[PDB]
Amino acid sequence: GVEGAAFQSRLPHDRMTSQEAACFPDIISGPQQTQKVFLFIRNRTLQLWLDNPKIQLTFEATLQQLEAPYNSDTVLVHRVHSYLERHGLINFGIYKRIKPLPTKKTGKVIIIGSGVSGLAAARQLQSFGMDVTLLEARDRVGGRVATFRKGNYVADLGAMVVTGLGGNPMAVVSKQVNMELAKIKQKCPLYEANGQAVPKEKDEMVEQEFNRLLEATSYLSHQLDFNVLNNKPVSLGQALEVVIQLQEKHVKDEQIEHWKKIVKTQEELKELLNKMVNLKEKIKELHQQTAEFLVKSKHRDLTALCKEYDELAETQGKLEEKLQELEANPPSDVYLSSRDRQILDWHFANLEFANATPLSTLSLKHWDQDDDFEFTGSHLTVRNGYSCVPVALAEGLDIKLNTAVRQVRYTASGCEVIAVNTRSTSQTFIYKCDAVLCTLPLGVLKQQPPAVQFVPPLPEWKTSAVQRMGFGNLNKVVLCFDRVFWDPSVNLFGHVGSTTASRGELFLFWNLYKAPILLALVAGEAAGIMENISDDVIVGRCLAILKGIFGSSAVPQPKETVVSRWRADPWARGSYSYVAAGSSGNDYDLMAQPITPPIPRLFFAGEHTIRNYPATVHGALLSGLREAGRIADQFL
Ligand SMILES: Cc1cc2c(cc1C)N(C[C@H](O)[C@H](O)[C@H](O)COP(=O)(O)OP(=O)(O)OC[C@H]1O[C@@H](n3cnc4c(N)ncnc43)[C@H](O)[C@@H]1O)CNC(=O)NC(=O)C[C@@H](c1ccccc1)C[C@@H](O)N2
Numbered sequence: 001g002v003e004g005a006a007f008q009s010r011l012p013h014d015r016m017t018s019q020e021a022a023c024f025p026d027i028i029s030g031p032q033q034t035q036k037v038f039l040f041i042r043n044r045t046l047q048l049w050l051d052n053p054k055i056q057l058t059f060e061a062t063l064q065q066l067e068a069p070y071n072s073d074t075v076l077v078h079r080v081h082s083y084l085e086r087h088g089l090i091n092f093g094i095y096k097r098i099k100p101l102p103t104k105k106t107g108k109v110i111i112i113g114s115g116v117s118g119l120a121a122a123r124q125l126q127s128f129g130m131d132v133t134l135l136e137a138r139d140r141v142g143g144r145v146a147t148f149r150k151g152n153y154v155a156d157l158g159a160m161v162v163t164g165l166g167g168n169p170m171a172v173v174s175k176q177v178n179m180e181l182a183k184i185k186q187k188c189p190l191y192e193a194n195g196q197a198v199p200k201e202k203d204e205m206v207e208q209e210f211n212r213l214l215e216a217t218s219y220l221s222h223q224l225d226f227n228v229l230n231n232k233p234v235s236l237g238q239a240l241e242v243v244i245q246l247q248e249k250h251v252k253d254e255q256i257e258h259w260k261k262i263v264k265t266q267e268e269l270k271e272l273l274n275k276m277v278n279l280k281e282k283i284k285e286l287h288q289q290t291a292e293f294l295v296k297s298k299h300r301d302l303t304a305l306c307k308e309y310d311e312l313a314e315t316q317g318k319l320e321e322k323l324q325e326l327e328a329n330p331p332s333d334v335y336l337s338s339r340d341r342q343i344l345d346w347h348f349a350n351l352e353f354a355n356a357t358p359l360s361t362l363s364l365k366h367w368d369q370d371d372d373f374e375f376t377g378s379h380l381t382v383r384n385g386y387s388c389v390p391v392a393l394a395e396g397l398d399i400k401l402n403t404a405v406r407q408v409r410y411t412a413s414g415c416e417v418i419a420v421n422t423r424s425t426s427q428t429f430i431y432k433c434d435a436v437l438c439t440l441p442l443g444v445l446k447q448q449p450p451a452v453q454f455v456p457p458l459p460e461w462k463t464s465a466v467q468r469m470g471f472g473n474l475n476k477v478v479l480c481f482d483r484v485f486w487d488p489s490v491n492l493f494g495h496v497g498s499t500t501a502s503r504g505e506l507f508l509f510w511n512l513y514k515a516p517i518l519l520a521l522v523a524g525e526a527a528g529i530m531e532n533i534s535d536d537v538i539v540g541r542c543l544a545i546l547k548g549i550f551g552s553s554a555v556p557q558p559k560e561t562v563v564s565r566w567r568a569d570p571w572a573r574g575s576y577s578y579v580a581a582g583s584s585g586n587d588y589d590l591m592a593q594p595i596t597p598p599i600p601r602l603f604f605a606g607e608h609t610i611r612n613y614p615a616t617v618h619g620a621l622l623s624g625l626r627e628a629g630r631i632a633d634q635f636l
Contacts, residue, residue: 115143356472443573
């Protein structure tokens with residue numbers, strides 16, 4: 001009951017977090033009975049909020065709906081409600097407020113960017129009674145949540161998956177926004193480059209082998225600490241190649257051992273043939289041979305020699321059959337045939353899709369450092385279109401679109417941000433404020449010739465983090481037809497490319513929309529390069545693959561098409577972050593850390609600042625809530 005509320009809030013139901021210990025020292029340093037009371041009040045407040053997340057949960061309502069023993073202690077109930085409200089656990093997203101906001105606002109914060117992190121933080125700060133204004137360069141909210149919508153067609157070009165609702169804040173937001181989520185059928189038939197499907201024996205074998213290889217790299221990293229070699233950090237791709245070479249060595253070793261067994265039995269057979277020839281000569285001899293006594297004795301010893309040859313003939317046959325057994329039971333000649341390796345490269349391209357980067361750039365030690373925090377439940381797609389979330393979040397906010405920030409100024413007295421109009425650069429705007437929250441993408445912050453200048457410049461630790469972390473790329477191609485010509489029973493199907501270099505070109509197709517829309521991914525090394533190809537040609541290659549799969553007559557010419565180019569998009573410069581070889585999750589922590597020129601003035605949220613949930617919409621959401629809590633603590 002109330003135990004599940006804490007789980008859904010990413011918290012232990014029977015323990016106190018470090019943060020709670022900090023904010024409630026009299027309770028941890030006090031008797032355990034008071035701790036259990038505190039924990040029940042917290043869990044029950046969370047449950048009240050999650051049972052009905054469309055209305056604000058007030059201190060008064062919590063007191064009223066609390067059970068007999070606990071509704072008496074109003075001071076501790078208030079402390080708990082205030083703590084939860086400040087940190088974005090009970091009053092976040094879009095809810096109807098019971099009492100309108102005060103007219104006098106007690107602080108001025110400029111938020112750079114109108115993505116999920118910016119909008120979440122802005123909504124929180126506005127709830128807290130501060131003056132919030134969002135500056136966004138695009139002509140739309142959402143940032144890397146971007147939904148193409150035309151006629152009946154709806155298709156996401158940025159984020160498109162919610163990754164299990166157990167513990168996921170998106171759950172709440174879904175209920176608040178009326179997101180139409182649909183779980184993903186995990187059936188993904190692979191089709192070779194010729195167009196014929198991969199039979200399931202081969203599909204299953206290669207998937208098993210891929211998982212074994214990945215687990216092998218993990219064993220290399222953590223138990224054997226095969227982490228830095230020749231004064232360079234090992235990439236995941238490096239360790240994968242190491243593992244594959246080890247298995248190929250095992251293959252040729254077992255091959256050579258079998259070869260040697262065969263050769264020794266061949267030599268045994270040869271010397272037995274020779275010995276047999278010799279005794280055939282000796283019986284040949286003795287056959288041409290008291291005289292009756294002598295013929296008795298010569299018949300005697302020819303009997304002897306013939307039974308000896310019989311022994312040898314039995315042995316000849318026995319070893320001939322051992323030879324035949326080993327001629328007919330050889331082990332594998334190679335570890336992976338060409339088609340085997342192409343299917344393995346498809347699985348590698350799936351990993352490169354997931355991490356938005358080629359495997360040769362991921363930190364072997366830390367590429368999956370966030371796995372312990374993954375939510376429970378099936379993965380789902382957004383049928384309504386993910387853009388519903390940010391635009392719902394935008395309602396009632398002071399958001400100036402087409403306003404590109406180019407200089408941010410922070411000093412011990414105040415803050416200046418300077419922006420230009422994307423529509424007519426001539427006109428310039430200057431905003432003074434008390435604090436600046438920067439949700440600029442890590443790609444924008446990485447821009448070697450800076451799009452945005454910081455005055456004073458950002459410190460060495462922050463810039464070093466910005467350069468160490470990885471910022472990947474991933475692209476989508478949307479095709480909109482008039483008739484569904486694929487299997488509706490399947491949400492995904494793979495295309496196995498020809499070469500390792502281009503394994504990620506149009507390797508995965510999604511069918512996740514009510515209209516007849518197919519969505520093709522471009523991952524790894526192909527993702528950046530093919531941004532330089534025109535839409536007509538990329539669509540021609542998509543159509544060629546689909547014709548090979550379904551029949552040249554079966555697939556029509558598409559009515560509508562859209563191609564993302566996220567690395568060239570100047571407001572993103574890639575898809576999302578990843579743990580590059582030199583980096584670690586500490587770097588994410590350093591991205592979240594704020595800057596003081598005294599009190600802090602420049603704050604940081606976004607997908608690249610949450611250690612435990614990076615590269616995700618919900619990561620951006622949680623980081624927005626967290627930075628809003630921090631700023632409110634500092635200025636209220
Ligand atoms: C193409 C693509 C696809 C996906 C994902 C990205 C992309 C690019 N993600 C990434 C996700 O969107 C981001 O993690 C999230 O949206 C981050 O939100 P942020 O607020 O931190 O970053 P934004 O870019 O959205 O907002 C920054 C704002 O600042 C604006 N801006 C830039 N420069 C300036 C400037 N000078 N001045 C003012 N404003 C500026 C900019 O226009 C933008 O609006 C997805 N996030 C996600 O949860 N689930 C997904 O399935 C997507 C991916 C995924 C990731 C992890 C685990 C499972 C799945 C897989 C993919 O299919 N979904």
